[PDB]
Design a protein around this nucleic acid. Structure first.
Lengths: 59, 56, 493, 329, 86, 64, 231, 34
RNA sequence: UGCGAAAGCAGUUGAAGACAAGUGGCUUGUCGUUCGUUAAAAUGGCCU
């Protein structure tokens, strides 16, 4: 509905990560999201037609 | 110099028995079900369900 | 599994005088306008370039009509005597008009107030004035002086060429459409003369003997030209100096011709001809100048024209009558946020590797009888036959589909007096026609086979059976007397 | 840029080993270069940051040695799907190049160390390092039979090394950038080519003198030479292939390419060639048809024209014609 | 015309049958609820059965049968079942 | 060829199969094909059978 | 690198799914095409790309069966009365599901589907089900290979979303639970390895306009199990 | 038929006519990758 | 059924046995029975 509206909430602690996404993450108007089953890897598709890709270095 | 041959196939020829309802279809699928083995009255045709061609 | 076959509408063997494609196209020229002029409409030309306006020469005025409103946009009234000819230049930029005092006056089109130059031709009336069709700056005027003149419109004092040689009343010019040195002129002694303009010009190179006094000569090909005069028109091959067709399909003298090429039509070319008895006819130059369509008008038609080859809009056939009136028949022709949300719906697969297509085509809507025959509602299909707004071939095809398909009796089982009267009341009308009467025969035979007791009870279908009896009596007298005519011309073999 | 990170043929050019990334982990696969004689199972590197830095076909259980970036040479059989043996140095330094002669594996380290292993004994035989060779990223064994004397090591500047004395016996002027191919052509010549330049040079391994310079018309990625020095096919950065035919004859000091091959599709899209293989009269080129799956082509390179444009059939707008349905749907 | 069976606890549908062609005015059952009979303005009487042991252990009615006996409608239906009357 | 959903007694049809169905059976492990024998009885002078399996997904004649 | 940066999309990207095993990412949107990208770090290239004409897609899912893990179907669907199923074979053989086997009135659009695994529970034979969210409260569950309507589960209210939970039972047997939410906040759980019967009905504490439920921490439809013992 | 043959149709419809290291690695890899 | 033309022209329609119903027989009717002759109906209709 609005731009850049994505949060990653850690759990069991139920606390939102406060360092990502920042004000300069090109998330766009987030209209889909997907997690990789093995790589630890987000894909975030927005209304402009762009899948942006991030890797979580814990995995 | 003239010779006779039979070159082209015939009818499929299922089980022509009475007193068998249901399974009179003697054609089979493969286990890796990519080709379909049907008998004829002249031969065994083996079609392929992917390409609809007779392969053997 | 397949799709369901559509119910095929019963077509009989074709009767004579079917609707040809040529006459379907020429019959959709309709919505006639009749404009009463002050005198007989003698000439009518069209603008070539934006081919969308036409000039009508009545007496002592020339009116340009528009081809979208059919009202007079502009008018030229400052002639002293009867204006005779008025044609547009090939660029459509200016308009020449020959006048009964032998004063050719050329204005510019779409500006009646600026007379551009007044060529003072012969003291006799000048009856035909037209620019060259290849060249732009030469104007050919023939007059009642038995001599045509080619005028350069720069030097408008002496004619640059003086084509004499004709013995009586030259009334038509024409130019040959590929060789620009070649002027074919036509006079009231017959004898289409034609001149090479690089030569002397006081002698034609040859002459074509139309026997009647010609009224018009037009050029169809670069090779063949058509001259009308008298009750016929003739066509002449020009490379071989020789006549090759003549059509005399009129009662009175053919007054004018014109010709169309390459326009949107089943006919690739069309010559139409106007003939002082009411008729304008269209002839097809590709099958031997055979007539394909015609119009009859309310008096003797003096001149005619059609919209030119590149008309691109509302298309016109105009005919001006000697009665003093003008007949035109035309054929006509959410949010930026929401769009950004629903962006992709117009893409149609350009950069994409594989392109899949299994959207089925949407077929024509099924009528109620066809979907009832599909749903096996056979009595409801008969009921849907006998509604009033049904075509006669549609009632016939649902009767024939119920006859071939299942059972007349199934379609007729649960009926009584009030629900049989549509069938028999249509069978009265269908017994007259040849194509229906076999089906009407067996349907009436079945319904009197299985409703012979309702015949006794209800008196208000007894009278329907009696009317049907007199109908079959008239039809059997007709089918007997047709066999008598068949024998009486079998005798004459 | 290409998804195929590393790739090499076996000798005789019958199989191609190739390392590509698969969703943050390296995977090593082997494809036959002609099917007329898919292979859908890979070796998977299980760590997200362990990656292959070099690879070499051994010659007879057939295997690959994959030089990793943690001081290990994995030895991986291809018919089975496990690393059969894990050579390790004493360090964590990434290894820049390996080679083998017979059963004697040699390798270079990012700390400019030389290690020797024995494939028949699975043991680290020697470890040393030599002076004034400090940025090494290629080694090549100069062949003298079963004797594995004379390594040939590059650091932007090729140096010939006697291993009995562990010392440098010749010094070749290399390039202005790190050497990316360093291969022995004959028993007296070796070719070398650097990163980001389009100039190979062939040196005389007995004198130090450069015999000739070979000039590609784009920056060279890989090279292959036919086994008798008669032809050298290099593959460049713009996806083209350039064949120098008989480069070791008397276009006297620097020779251009004799033949140039590129591949276009039926559309006009130019696919890139990576990593071809040449032999006597036979040339096998490789590309990627879909995103990461290698396709091959054999060519009689002696009878093609000079500027040859291979055409491949590739899906661009083709209507999905299903075999169970006619064209009208 | 649809006839639906709803689990009382959880208050929710188990299965729906599309039985009649118009309204279902009246429906009834027997003593041990092995049958449910139903009827309405389309003038057929439908019977929904659960008599099989698998039907009773799976809670699955089947649309067993259907009879056309009435002339115009059925506005009332009832059932009696005793030792000498069913 | 009708197939009766035995829960709700609900037919799904396949209506114009150029022959009467004298044998039909499911075929696959998951039942993804139907094999049919169609007797094509407009000619009474011969018993001419068409063998037609078809995939159960879109009910299209795979390999007639 | 942005995954669809190699080949741009002509619409908003409406759905997005990774492969269960391969390094593939399937994107798809209202420009009625669906694209597969081999993803890695550097160069996310385009594997293949299929443009279904006249069928804008809204949900697209990699399905991979549990028996042989060799099918690799892609199920895709939008605001249409059909749903396509591409069988991955590296021409392209896709089939179309367009028959609700008697239940077309309660399913007028195939938009919101989810794909899941189901066990026969008299054999140890699993098969994929697609689950369609319909009008009244209905979820129509149907076979992912034959398209036969297996069962239906009706909740009471405005169905807004649903998810699939699995729970293991023994060696090689698991049980599939459909979890469907009203708009108001009350949640039904249906056991559907038997007939689609309710086992639990609870209520969300707070929550009045409910758009999306999801489970996680085990095998969801977006983290799928490749092997039946890994459920 | 129009090229000097004669076709005939049997009553059981048979149409007849009257006329005028690396090798073992390759084998085991095509085994183990199929 | 045979010969025919699409009209028509010649030929008909027996026996055995078993079973069912009705009143061991008698009557009637059937036959996934045989020999001889060239010889209307279970509310039940067509996909997306």
């Amino acid at each position: 509905a609005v731009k850049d509206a994505l949060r990653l909430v850690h759990l069991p602690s139920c606390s939102v990560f406060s360092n990502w996404p920042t004000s300069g993450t090109p998330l766009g108007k987030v209209t889909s999201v997907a997690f990789s089953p093995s790589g630890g890897l987000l894909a975030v598709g927005n209304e402009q037609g762009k899948v942006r890709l991030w890797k979580l270095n814990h995995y | 110099q003239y010779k006779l041959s039979v070159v082209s196939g015939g009818k499929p020829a299922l089980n022509n028995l009475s007193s068998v309802t249901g399974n009179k279809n003697i054609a089979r699928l493969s286990q890796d079900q990519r080709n379909y083995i049907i008998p004829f009255n002249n031969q065994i045709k083996v079609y392929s369900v992917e390409t609809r061609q007779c392969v053997k | 599994s397949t799709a369901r076959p559509r119910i095929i509408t019963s077509k009989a063997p074709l009767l004579p005088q079917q609707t040809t494609p040529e006459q379907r196209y020429w019959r959709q020229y309709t919505s006639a306008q009749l404009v009463k002029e002050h005198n007989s409409v003698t000439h009518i030309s069209f603008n070539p370039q934006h081919p969308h306006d036409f000039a009508v020469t009545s007496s002592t005025r020339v009116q340009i009509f528009s081809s979208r409103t059919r009202q007079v946009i502009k008018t030229f009234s400052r002639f002293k005597d009867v204006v005779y000819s008025a044609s547009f230049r090939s660029d459509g930029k200016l308009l020449c008009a020959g006048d009964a005092t032998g004063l050719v006056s050329v204005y510019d089109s779409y500006n009646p107030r600026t007379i551009l130059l007044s060529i003072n031709a012969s003291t006799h009336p000048t009856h035909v004035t037209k620019f060259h069709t290849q060249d732009n700056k030469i104007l050919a005027t023939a007059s009642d002086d038995r001599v045509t003149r080619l005028w350069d419109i720069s030097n408008a004092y002496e004619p640059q060429l003086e084509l004499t040689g004709a013995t009586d009343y030259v009334r038509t010019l024409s130019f040959i459409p590929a060789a620009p040195h070649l002027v074919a002129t036509g006079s009231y002694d017959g004898l289409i003369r034609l001149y090479d303009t690089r030569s002397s010009g006081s002698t034609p190179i040859y002459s074509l003997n139309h026997d009647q006094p010609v009224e018009n000569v037009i050029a169809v090909s670069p090779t063949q030209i058509v001259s009308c005069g008298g009750n016929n028109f003739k066509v002449w091959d020009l490379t071989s100096n020789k006549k090759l067709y003549e059509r005399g399909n009129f009662n009175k003298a053919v007054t004018c011709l014109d010709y169309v090429e390459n326009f949107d039509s089943p006919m690739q070319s069309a010559l139409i001809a106007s003939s002082l008895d009411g008729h304008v006819k269209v002839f097809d130059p590709l099958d031997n100048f055979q007539v394909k369509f015609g119009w009859k008008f309310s008096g003797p038609v003096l001149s005619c024209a059609v919209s030119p080859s590149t008309a691109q809009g509302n298309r016109h056939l105009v005919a001006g009558l000697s009665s003093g009136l003008l007949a035109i028949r035309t054929k006509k022709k959410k949010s930026n946020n929401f769009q950004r949300m629903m962006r992709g719906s117009e893409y149609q697969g350009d950069q994409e590797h594989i392109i899949h297509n299994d959207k089925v085509r949407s077929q024509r809507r099924m009528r109620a009888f066809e979907r009832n025959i599909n749903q096996f509602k056979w009595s409801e299909a008969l009921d849907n036959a006998f509604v009033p707004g049904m075509a006669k071939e549609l009632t016939l095809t649902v009767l024939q589909e119920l006859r071939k398909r299942g059972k007349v009796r199934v379609a007729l089982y649960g009926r009584d007096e009030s629900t049989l009267e549509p069938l028999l009341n249509w069978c009265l009308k269908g017994i007259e026609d040849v194509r229906s009467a076999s089906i009407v025969a067996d349907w009436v035979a079945v319904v009197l086979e299985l409703y012979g007791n309702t015949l006794e009870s209800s008196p208000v279908l007894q009278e329907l059976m009696i009317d049907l009896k007199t109908k079959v009596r008239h039809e059997i007298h007709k089918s007997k007397e047709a066999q008598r005519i068949e024998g009486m011309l079998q005798l004459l073999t | 840029d290409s998804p195929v990170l590393q790739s090499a043929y076996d000798p005789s050019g019958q199989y191609l080993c190739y390392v590509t990334v698969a969703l943050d982990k390296q995977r090593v696969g082997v494809q036959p270069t002609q099917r007329a004689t898919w292979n859908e199972n890979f070796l998977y590197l299980e760590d997200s940051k362990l990656k292959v830095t070099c690879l070499k076909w051994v010659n007879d259980t057939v295997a690959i040695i994959l030089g990793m970036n943690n001081g290990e040479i994995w030895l991986y059989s291809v018919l089975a799907n496990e690393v059969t043996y894990k050579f390790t140095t004493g360090n964590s330094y990434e290894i820049k190049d390996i080679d083998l002669m017979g059963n004697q594996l040699w390798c270079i380290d990012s700390s400019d160390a030389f290690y020797q292993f024995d494939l028949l004994q699975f043991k680290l035989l020697q470890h040393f390092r030599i002076n004034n060779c400090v940025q090494l990223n290629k080694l090549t064994i100069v062949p003298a039979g079963d004797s594995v004397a004379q390594l040939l090591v590059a650091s932007h500047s090729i140096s010939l090394i006697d291993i009995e004395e562990k010392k440098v016996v010749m010094t070749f002027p290399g390039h202005v950038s790190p050497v990316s191919t360093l291969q022995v052509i004959t028993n007296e010549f070796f070719i070398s080519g650097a990163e980001g330049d389009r100039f190979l040079n062939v040196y005389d391994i007995h004198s130090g003198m450069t015999k000739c310079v070979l000039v590609a018309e784009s920056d060279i990625k890989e090279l292959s030479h036919s086994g008798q020095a008669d032809s050298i096919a290099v593959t460049t950065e713009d996806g083209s292939l350039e064949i120098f035919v008989d480069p070791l004859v008397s276009g006297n000091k620097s020779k251009k390419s004799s033949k140039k091959i590129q591949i276009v599709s039926k559309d006009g899209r130019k696919v890139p060639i990576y990593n071809a293989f040449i032999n006597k009269d036979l040339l096998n080129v490789s590309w990627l048809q879909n995103a990461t799956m290698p396709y091959f082509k054999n060519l009689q390179w002696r009878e093609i024209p000079n500027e040859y444009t291979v055409e491949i059939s590739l899906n661009w707008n083709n209507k999905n014609k299903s075999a169970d349905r006619d064209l009208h749907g | 015309g649809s006839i639906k069976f709803w689990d009382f606890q959880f208050a929710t549908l188990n299965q729906s049958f599309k039985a009649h062609d118009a309204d279902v005015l009246c429906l009834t059952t027997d003593t041990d609820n092995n049958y449910v009979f139903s009827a309405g303005v389309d003038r057929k009487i439908f019977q929904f059965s659960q008599n099989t042991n698998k039907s009773q252990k799976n809670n699955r009615w089947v649309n067993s049968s259907n009879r056309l006996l009435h002339g115009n409608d059925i506005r009332a239906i009832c059932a009696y079942q005793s030792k000498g009357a069913d | 060829m009708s197939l009766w959903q035995l829960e709700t007694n609900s037919q799904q049809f396949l209506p114009r199969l150029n022959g009467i169905i004298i044998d039909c059976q499911v075929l696959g492990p998951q039942g993804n094909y139907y094999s049919l024998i169609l007797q094509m009885t407009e000619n009474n002078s011969n018993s001419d059978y068409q063998f037609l399996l078809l995939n159960a997904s879109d009910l299209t004649s795979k390999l007639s | 690198k942005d995954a669809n940066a190699s080949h741009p999309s002509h619409s908003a990207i409406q759905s997005l799914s990774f492969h269960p095993s391969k390094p593939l990412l399937l994107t798809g949107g209202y420009d009625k095409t669906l694209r597969i990208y081999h993803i890695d770090g550097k160069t996310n290239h385009l594997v293949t790309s299929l443009h279904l004409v006249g069928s804008p897609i809204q949900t697209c899912t990699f399905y991979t069966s549990l028996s042989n893990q060799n099918q690799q179907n892609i199920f895709t669907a939008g605001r249409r009365r059909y749903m396509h199923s591409w069988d991955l074979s590296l021409t392209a053989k896709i089939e179309k599901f367009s028959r609700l086997y008697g239940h077309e009135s309660t399913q007028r659009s195939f938009e919101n589907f989810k794909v899941a695994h189901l066990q026969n529970s008299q054999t140890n034979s699993v098969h994929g089900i697609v689950l369609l969210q319909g009008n009244n409260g209905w979820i129509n569950i149907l076979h992912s290979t034959s398209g036969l309507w297996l069962m239906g589960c009706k909740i009471e209210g405005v169905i807004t979303d649903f998810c699939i939970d699995y729970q293991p039972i023994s060696r090689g047997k698991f049980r599939t639970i459909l979890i469907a939410v009203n708009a108001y906040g009350e949640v039904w759980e249906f056991d559907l390895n038997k007939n689609g019967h309710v086992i639990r009905r609870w209520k969300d504490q707070g929550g009045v306009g409910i758009t999306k439920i999801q489970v996680g921490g085990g095998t969801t439809t977006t983290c799928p199990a490749l092997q039946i013992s890994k459920i | 038929n129009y090229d000097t043959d004669f076709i005939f149709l049997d009553i059981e419809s048979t149409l007849g006519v009257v006329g005028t290291n690396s090798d073992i690695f390759a084998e085991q890899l095509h085994k183990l990758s199929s």
